[PDB]
Paper text:
ZER1 and ZYG11B, the substrate receptors of the Cullin 2-RING E3 ubiquitin ligase (CRL2), recognize N-terminal (Nt) glycine degrons and participate in the Nt-myristoylation quality control through the Gly/N-degron pathway. Here we show that ZER1 and ZYG11B can also recognize small Nt-residues other than glycine. Furthermore, we present the crystal structures of ZER1 and ZYG11B bound to various small Nt-residues and uncover the molecular mechanism of non-acetylated substrate recognition by ZER1 and ZYG11B. In conclusion, we propose that ZER1/ZYG11B not only targets Gly/N-degrons for proteasomal degradation, but it also has the ability to bind a defined selection of non-Ac/N-degrons by a conserved molecular mechanism of substrate recognition and target their degradation through the non-Ac/N-degron pathway.
To understand the molecular basis of ZER1/ZYG11B-mediated binding of non-Gly Nt-residue peptides, we determined the crystal structures of ZER1 bound to either SFLH-, AFLH- or TFLH-peptide, as well as the crystal structures of ZYG11B bound to either SFLH-, AFLH- or CFLH- peptide. In line with our SPOT-array results, ZER1 binds to XFLHVGQD peptides in which X is either Ser (KD of 1.3), Ala (KD of 1.6), Thr (KD of 3.1) or Cys (KD of 3.9) more potently than to the Gly-starting peptide (KD of 4.2). Intriguingly, unlike ZER1, ZYG11B was unable to bind to Nt-Thr, although they adopt similar structural architectures. The free α-amino group of the Nt-residue forms hydrogen bonds with the side chains of Asp556 and Asn597 in ZER1 (the counterparts of Asp 526 and Asn 567 in ZYG11B), respectively. Furthermore, the carbonyl oxygen of the Nt-residue is stabilized by two hydrogen bonds from Asn597 and Trp552 in ZER1 (Asp 567 and Trp522 in ZYG11B). Besides, a strong π-π interaction was formed between the aromatic side chain of F2 and the indole ring of Trp 552 in ZER1 (Trp 522 in ZYG11B), this observation is consistent with our SPOT-array results that ZER1 and ZYG11B prefer an aromatic residue at position 2. Our ITC assays indicated that any alanine mutation of W552, D556, N597 or E600 in ZER1, which would disrupt the direct hydrogen bonds with Nt-residue, abolished the binding to the XFLHVGQD (X = Ser, Ala, Cys or Thr) peptides, highlighting the key role of these hydrogen bonds in mediating Nt-residue recognition. In addition, mutating the third-residue-interacting N553 into alanine caused a significant reduction in substrate binding.
Numbering used by the authors:
A (entry chain B): 516 to 689, 691 to 759
B (entry chain D): 516 to 621, 625 to 650, 654 to 690, 692 to 756
The structure:
Amino acid sequence: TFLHKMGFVVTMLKLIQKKLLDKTCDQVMEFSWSALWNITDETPDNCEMFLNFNGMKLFLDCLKEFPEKQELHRNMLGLLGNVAEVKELRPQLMTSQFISVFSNLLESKADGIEVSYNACGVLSHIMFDGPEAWGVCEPQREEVEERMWAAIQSWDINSRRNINYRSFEPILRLPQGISPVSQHWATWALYNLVSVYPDKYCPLLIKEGGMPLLRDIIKMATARQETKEMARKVIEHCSNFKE
Amino acid sequence: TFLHKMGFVVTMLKLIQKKLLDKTCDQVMEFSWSALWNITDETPDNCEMFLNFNGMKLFLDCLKEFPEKQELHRNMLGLLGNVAEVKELRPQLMTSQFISVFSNLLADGIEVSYNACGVLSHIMFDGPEAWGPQREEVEERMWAAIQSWDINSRRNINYRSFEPILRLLQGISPVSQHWATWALYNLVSVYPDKYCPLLIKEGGMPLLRDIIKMATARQETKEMARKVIEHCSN
């Protein structure tokens, strides 16, 4: 049982604003950000109100006053990944300042890979909408497309993680041909998470039908071959799990 | 995606204590309890740390010190429902004062006493031996609660899976079955588009058929089960 009402995000952002004007990144502020992160999971209404209650400004301002608060950035970027998974709200993330900050966080060594992983997930969900939808001119899409490839092979594929998935469907919709690097990030996420937490994620992956889509990714000629390697690798880890 | 680590639980009972000692139930405290409620969903470890961080004591003290901040009671009883779904931890809720306040609270719609009836149905699933008020005294009071509630009342509750109430659909306590079936029927009578997919999902229809063919089952529970199945087909 649970409950997420929209007043809750508002109160969390008010407390965050206060602890920002107190220049205090205390446990309670990382806590407010983690609470927004949890509350937004697969619930578009709360991402919408986070956007409407000056959420991006508080994000950037806590980036600015606490440049080396690793777990804060982790929580903020998990929240923003959740926000990026609602595509009709993704237009509000298509400004050169938002995309600049996202791409500049592809190299954050904060909490391992979490900040870079979440920034790259946000940008992958932003790329799934197609090449038409970035009417920003700078930064440029192929510039941080390449930067995303660099981030994805930066990460150790046996890295332990500070993240949890209740469903893989948001990643399993990134089965298309419009953006290969989104697709590659999806395959990487699956590979890492069942390589390091098999007992946890190969049941979830089989359950939601990830194997037919990974097989289809190996069976499409348009698919870039390193994604096909990583998909064959996820398939083999999950098949060894079932066996 | 999400992540709630167990340390977060600590912070809320930390913060609650402050504004329990100043007796100020501001929006942030009703949130503190709502956050504990959310962190407890299908996560036994964080209910463990709520219990081990004298959670029951602040439950009692926030019950009495803020007697009619309904949504505070809402959140607290939802939290306690989440902790009651864990079999390991139900022994710590069997003191006669804990059961006292639970059945005695058998509110913003049904929420408080719906949650009281969920906690008590989950403890009764464990059998008459594991009940060391008296058990069929609170059996009549739980039947009474289920016959109070409007079955098409609007709610402020959320279920991501029906699995906790689908394992109470069993013969050790027929009132488990009655409360679970009532829950399913209210929410699929009223929020079908969200919850009848959830019920098909985990294979509820064969179990409801089995409830219609169960000798231990009371005939109004088979009543509601058969009406649930046909609503699900509708």
